[PDB]
Structures are given as C-alpha cells and as structure tokens.
Amino acid sequence: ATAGTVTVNAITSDDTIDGIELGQTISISGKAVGGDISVGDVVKMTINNTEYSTTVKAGGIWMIAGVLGSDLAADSEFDVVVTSSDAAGNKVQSIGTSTHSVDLSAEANFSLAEGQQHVLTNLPEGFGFPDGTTEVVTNFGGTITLGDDGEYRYDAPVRDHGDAVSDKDSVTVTLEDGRTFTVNLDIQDSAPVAVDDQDSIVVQHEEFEVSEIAASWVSYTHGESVTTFDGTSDLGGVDNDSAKDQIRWGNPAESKQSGYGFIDNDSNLEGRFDLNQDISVGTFTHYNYPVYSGGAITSAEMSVEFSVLDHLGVSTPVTLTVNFDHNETPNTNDVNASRDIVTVQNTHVTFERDGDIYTVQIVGFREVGNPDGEVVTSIYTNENAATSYELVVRVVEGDGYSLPSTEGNIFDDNGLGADSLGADGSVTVVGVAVGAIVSSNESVGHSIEGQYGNLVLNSDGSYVYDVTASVSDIPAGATESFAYLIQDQDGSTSSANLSINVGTN
Ligand SMILES: [Ca+2]
Ligand SMILES: [Ca+2]
Ligand SMILES: [Ca+2]
Ligand SMILES: [Ca+2]
Ligand SMILES: [Ca+2]
Ligand SMILES: [Ca+2]
Ligand SMILES: [Ca+2]
Ligand SMILES: [Ca+2]
Ligand SMILES: [Ca+2]
Ligand SMILES: [Ca+2]
Ligand SMILES: [Ca+2]
Ligand SMILES: [Ca+2]
Ligand SMILES: [Ca+2]
Ligand SMILES: [Ca+2]
Ligand SMILES: [Ca+2]
Ligand SMILES: [Ca+2]
Structure with missing residues (x-):
C-alpha cells in the first residue's frame, strides 16, 4: 500500500477562527490524492476530542460539512487520516496535518470629548458584558455602563492633554466563551470659549x-x-x-x-x-x-x-x-x-x-x-x-486724583454671555492687546495704551479702563476694542474682544 498526499484547506478564508465564527458551524475541506488512495476511502480527524469522518470523493476531494466553531477555537492543530488499500488487500494510512490561528478578539475605537458622557454606537457585532455585569472600569478609572435602555455609556474623564501621559483610555471585556472586546477611547481635549464684552464710559463736556x-x-x-x-x-x-x-x-x-x-x-x-x-x-x-x-x-x-x-x-x-x-x-x-x-x-x-x-x-x-x-x-x-x-x-x-474710568471683568456676562471655561478649568487671561489680534503676551496686568485711554486687564479677568484723550479728540461713536486671550489648564486658548463705547455729554 502506497500512501497518498493528504492536504487540508485553510480553516475559513484567513485560516483563523474569530469571535463571530466561534458561534458558527464551519465546513472543513481538503484533498486526498496519490498512492493507493481511492474514491470512497475513509477520512477521519479528531478536533477538540470529537471525531469527524467522511469519504474521499472523485478527484480526491473531501469535505466535512459542519465542524463547530467552538471546537476549532479549542483545538488549533489536527491530523487528517485517510485509510486506503492496494488491490491485494494491503492497508495503508495517508496523513495530513492542519494548523490554524485562534483570535477571538474584536476592538471598538472611539474618539470622544473629555468631561462628557457618551453613548457608544456601532459596537462590534456580538459586543456585550458577561452575564450580570453592568459596568466595566477603564484604565483611567472611567466607566462603560450598560443602562436600562440597553445603551452603553462611557464617562470620559477630564485629562491634562499637555503632559507626558497618553490620554487614550481603554478597557477589555472578557466573555466566558473566550471572546474579548477591546474598547479604545481616545479622549479629546476641550477648550474654553471667550465671549465678546461690552462696556461704556461717558466723558463730561463743560x-x-x-x-x-x-x-x-x-x-x-x-x-x-x-x-x-x-x-x-x-x-x-x-x-x-x-x-x-x-x-x-x-x-x-x-x-x-x-x-x-x-x-x-x-x-x-x-x-x-x-x-x-x-x-x-x-x-x-x-x-x-x-x-x-x-x-x-x-x-x-x-x-x-x-x-x-x-x-x-x-x-x-x-x-x-x-x-x-x-x-x-x-x-x-x-x-x-x-x-x-x-x-x-x-x-x-x-x-x-x-x-x-x-x-x-x-x-x-x-x-x-x-x-x-x-x-x-x-x-x-x-x-x-x-x-x-x-x-x-x-x-x-473733582480733586484730580483719577481720570474718568470704567471697570469690569471679561469673565462676567457683559452683554453676550459669560466666557465658557471648558472641562479643563484653570482658565486665566494670558494675553491682551489693542486691536483685533492677540496672543499670549506680556501685557496682562500691565497698563496698555488704547486709542482714547489706557487699559489694565489682569489674569483673573478684572480690568480698569481710563480715558486719557481730550474731549475734542473723541469722535461721535468712538469705540475702543481690546482683544484678550484666555487659556485653560493644558494650553487651549480662546480670544474675544472687550469693546468700550467712549462717549461725550
Ligand atoms: Ca476566519
Ligand atoms: Ca455570535
Ligand atoms: Ca486503493
Ligand atoms: Ca489537536
Ligand atoms: Ca492552515
Ligand atoms: Ca497559518
Ligand atoms: Ca495627558
Ligand atoms: Ca484636557
Ligand atoms: Ca505787557
Ligand atoms: Ca506781562
Ligand atoms: Ca494777559
Ligand atoms: Ca461702565
Ligand atoms: Ca467675555
Ligand atoms: Ca549749557
Ligand atoms: Ca546756557
Ligand atoms: Ca484644553
């Protein structure tokens, strides 16, 4: 008896059992050809301690209609044995070997704003928590919670996006059937929103x-x-x-x-x-x-x-x-x-x-x-x-101790709403300039010269503006505009304009 060649095709197209195939029935196939291998010969293989059999078909083809995905996930290597005979009764066994990979993992990737709760959508097929579990704690101490409504909600912690520590949170859920789901949560930075401010000051003519x-x-x-x-x-x-x-x-x-x-x-x-x-x-x-x-x-x-x-x-x-x-x-x-x-x-x-x-x-x-x-x-x-x-x-x-002045704080609601500070907090005024353009500069807490007067705007947002111009140089509808820039804990910045109506009467 001359042995033939026994070959096993890839176990699924990519030769690996994944988390979805784990719960499915999987056809195995291959060939048995050469030697004394003949049509009808018995083909046997043990996978995860279960024997599957079939026969050699014309052209040396053999197939197993349905092997449990769980078996192939539990046993990643197996032999296929074909039993054959020569004309004169002599037996022989042709042996082939199959290996495949087992990867029951699946990942879900999100990019979500810090300091907010988010519903997680488009999770991988079959995603879920182990029976009884309604919450998993992430690497950063946040949580993914399964709610009454069946939605999964992630509480994104606030992060210092300026430091040397990654702000990509993550968690891995493990199910009893071997599946894992890795949820990667790229925490996005928040920023303050400066809001334009309005003030007014009238200079007395007489x-x-x-x-x-x-x-x-x-x-x-x-x-x-x-x-x-x-x-x-x-x-x-x-x-x-x-x-x-x-x-x-x-x-x-x-x-x-x-x-x-x-x-x-x-x-x-x-x-x-x-x-x-x-x-x-x-x-x-x-x-x-x-x-x-x-x-x-x-x-x-x-x-x-x-x-x-x-x-x-x-x-x-x-x-x-x-x-x-x-x-x-x-x-x-x-x-x-x-x-x-x-x-x-x-x-x-x-x-x-x-x-x-x-x-x-x-x-x-x-x-x-x-x-x-x-x-x-x-x-x-x-x-x-x-x-x-x-x-x-x-x-x-008056006594001449001070010039006409008006004061305020650019963080207050000065006609259009209060500046929004964002989730990071630690917001301070880091720049101030006359005109429409400002960056972090060295004028905060300093007296800067405007068109008609001087401004001292401090890091806490408080400001004093005093008119220095002569009445004769203040036109109808005169207006100062100072751009200011605020900055949160990890460097996010926002600019707004403090507009001061400078009037006469
Ligand atoms: Ca596969
Ligand atoms: Ca499934
Ligand atoms: Ca034969
Ligand atoms: Ca095995
Ligand atoms: Ca293989
Ligand atoms: Ca392989
Ligand atoms: Ca960080
Ligand atoms: Ca941040
Ligand atoms: Ca004289
Ligand atoms: Ca004189
Ligand atoms: Ca005189
Ligand atoms: Ca005022
Ligand atoms: Ca403001
Ligand atoms: Ca001299
Ligand atoms: Ca002299
Ligand atoms: Ca920020």
Whole structure:
C-alpha cells in the first residue's frame, strides 16, 4: 500500500477562527490524492476530542460539512487520516496535518470629548458584558455602563492633554466563551470659549468762562543779576498786561542773559476753557545763552492767575503756581551735552464754582502748533538758541486724583454671555492687546495704551479702563476694542474682544 498526499484547506478564508465564527458551524475541506488512495476511502480527524469522518470523493476531494466553531477555537492543530488499500488487500494510512490561528478578539475605537458622557454606537457585532455585569472600569478609572435602555455609556474623564501621559483610555471585556472586546477611547481635549464684552464710559463736556491770564515770575533760587519784567519787543515780546512774564539771569559770557519768557494765550482762548481738554495757557520760551558759571537759577516759580465766572456773575480768582527746575549745564564741544534743560513740575490748583470743585493740572510742554503732539515735562535747548512750547494744562471735575474710568471683568456676562471655561478649568487671561489680534503676551496686568485711554486687564479677568484723550479728540461713536486671550489648564486658548463705547455729554 502506497500512501497518498493528504492536504487540508485553510480553516475559513484567513485560516483563523474569530469571535463571530466561534458561534458558527464551519465546513472543513481538503484533498486526498496519490498512492493507493481511492474514491470512497475513509477520512477521519479528531478536533477538540470529537471525531469527524467522511469519504474521499472523485478527484480526491473531501469535505466535512459542519465542524463547530467552538471546537476549532479549542483545538488549533489536527491530523487528517485517510485509510486506503492496494488491490491485494494491503492497508495503508495517508496523513495530513492542519494548523490554524485562534483570535477571538474584536476592538471598538472611539474618539470622544473629555468631561462628557457618551453613548457608544456601532459596537462590534456580538459586543456585550458577561452575564450580570453592568459596568466595566477603564484604565483611567472611567466607566462603560450598560443602562436600562440597553445603551452603553462611557464617562470620559477630564485629562491634562499637555503632559507626558497618553490620554487614550481603554478597557477589555472578557466573555466566558473566550471572546474579548477591546474598547479604545481616545479622549479629546476641550477648550474654553471667550465671549465678546461690552462696556461704556461717558466723558463730561463743560465750558468755563475765564478772564484774561496774568503770568508772573514770583520767585527763583540761585542766579546772578536775576531780573523779572513785563515783556518787551526786544526781550520776550509783548503781552496785554503788566504782569512780569520774563525772567533773565547770568553774567553774559558772549552776548545776552539766559532766561524764560511766557506769553499768555489770552487772544486764542477768547475767554473760554473746556473741561477734560488739553488747553494751552500760553507759550513758554527758553532763551539759552552762554553765561559764566554759577550765574544761573536752579528753579523758578511762575503764578498763572485768572478768574472763573459762574452763572450768577460771581468771579472766583485762581492761581496756578508752576515750578520750573533749571539746569544751565557746563558748555563743552558737545552741542547736545551743552544743552540747557528745563523741567516743569506736575502741580495743580483746585477751585470751586457753583458748588462743584475743579482741578487745573499742569500737563506739560507741547511743540507749538502741534496740538496733537507729544507732551513732555523736560525740554532741551542748545546754547545760543531759544525753544518755544505751549504750556498745556487740563481742567477736570473733582480733586484730580483719577481720570474718568470704567471697570469690569471679561469673565462676567457683559452683554453676550459669560466666557465658557471648558472641562479643563484653570482658565486665566494670558494675553491682551489693542486691536483685533492677540496672543499670549506680556501685557496682562500691565497698563496698555488704547486709542482714547489706557487699559489694565489682569489674569483673573478684572480690568480698569481710563480715558486719557481730550474731549475734542473723541469722535461721535468712538469705540475702543481690546482683544484678550484666555487659556485653560493644558494650553487651549480662546480670544474675544472687550469693546468700550467712549462717549461725550
Ligand atoms: Ca476566519
Ligand atoms: Ca455570535
Ligand atoms: Ca486503493
Ligand atoms: Ca489537536
Ligand atoms: Ca492552515
Ligand atoms: Ca497559518
Ligand atoms: Ca495627558
Ligand atoms: Ca484636557
Ligand atoms: Ca494777559
Ligand atoms: Ca505787557
Ligand atoms: Ca506781562
Ligand atoms: Ca546756557
Ligand atoms: Ca549749557
Ligand atoms: Ca461702565
Ligand atoms: Ca467675555
Ligand atoms: Ca484644553
């Protein structure tokens, strides 16, 4: 008896029993050909301790109609034996061997937002918990719960998506029949949602009726040959009063004396001041000549006197004292170093009118004819030259301790709802900027300059905005817009705009 070749085809198409085939009946097949193998010969095989048999068909084909999937899952290797004979009664056995893989697992993949409950849909066919189990705890301590309604719900924990620890949760369910189901839960990050904010602030307009101004140099410290006088054509130019608007000093080292002159702004003011408005009370001229060392003042005081009229015709006199520190510097071959320096002090005076109080405050020096120019408190003048600047004051209601302001918190509901913080929390303001664009920057908790005023917005969302612009520079419908950026625990960010209506009345 000559043995043949016994072959076993793949056990299912992929040669592996999976979790669905586990519960099904599976046809096995193969061939038995060659040698003394003849049609009708017996084919036998033991699978998981059960014997299955059939016969060899024409062409050497053999098949087993139905083997239990559970048997093939329990026994991954088996022999097939074909019993044959030669013509002369002699027996022989042809043997083939089959191996297959067993993988009863199945995975379900989800990508779900943190801090929310989610119904798990499209689970793999046959998914379920072991009898009695209604909850499985995930690797992260979350849960998949089977509810009354037969739905499976996953409670996605909040995660720090910025750290070095993966945020892909997972759990494996094991059933008694050997199946496993691995649920992979990619936890997605949440973010805050900043919401635009609205605030408003009104600046008070009011016009005062004022007398002519009389400016007098009333005192000085140090200096030689110091004199004070009403201005003349040759020395300072003329004004409409007899107050002493010119001061001169020094022993001239080349030609004339150094000093100051102040020509009031009576004609331009036309007897009116406005409130909350940069106003020029006059033109200050610094005449810098070379004088011998030790002959110059170090400070001088000028009284700016004027009366304010109320609606009943009562005049209130007002004296703004203006202190100037003077530095007549040693002269070298360096022109810039040789410049003489005048510094005006930020003084003020408060007067009463019709039961309200108002404060006149020195703002400082402004280049002549440049009423939108930068205001400075120190001016520099070359030797052998004179510089001229408007002396700018502002009048405000009250004691002048603070400018018109409005405050708030961008986390509050300021007209369109409160910022949403997201599941991560730990939200703070990390950036603020004037305009429409902002990123995490170094302006939070700082004073930043807007179009009409300054903003201090802090990390906790609180802000103070104060108007610095003159009334005359605040157009109808004026508006500030500050973009701010908030950030949660693991870096998610959201921007919104704080819009401030800046009005006049
Ligand atoms: Ca298969
Ligand atoms: Ca099944
Ligand atoms: Ca035979
Ligand atoms: Ca076996
Ligand atoms: Ca195989
Ligand atoms: Ca294989
Ligand atoms: Ca993480
Ligand atoms: Ca997160
Ligand atoms: Ca005058
Ligand atoms: Ca005069
Ligand atoms: Ca005068
Ligand atoms: Ca000088
Ligand atoms: Ca000098
Ligand atoms: Ca307000
Ligand atoms: Ca907001
Ligand atoms: Ca986040």
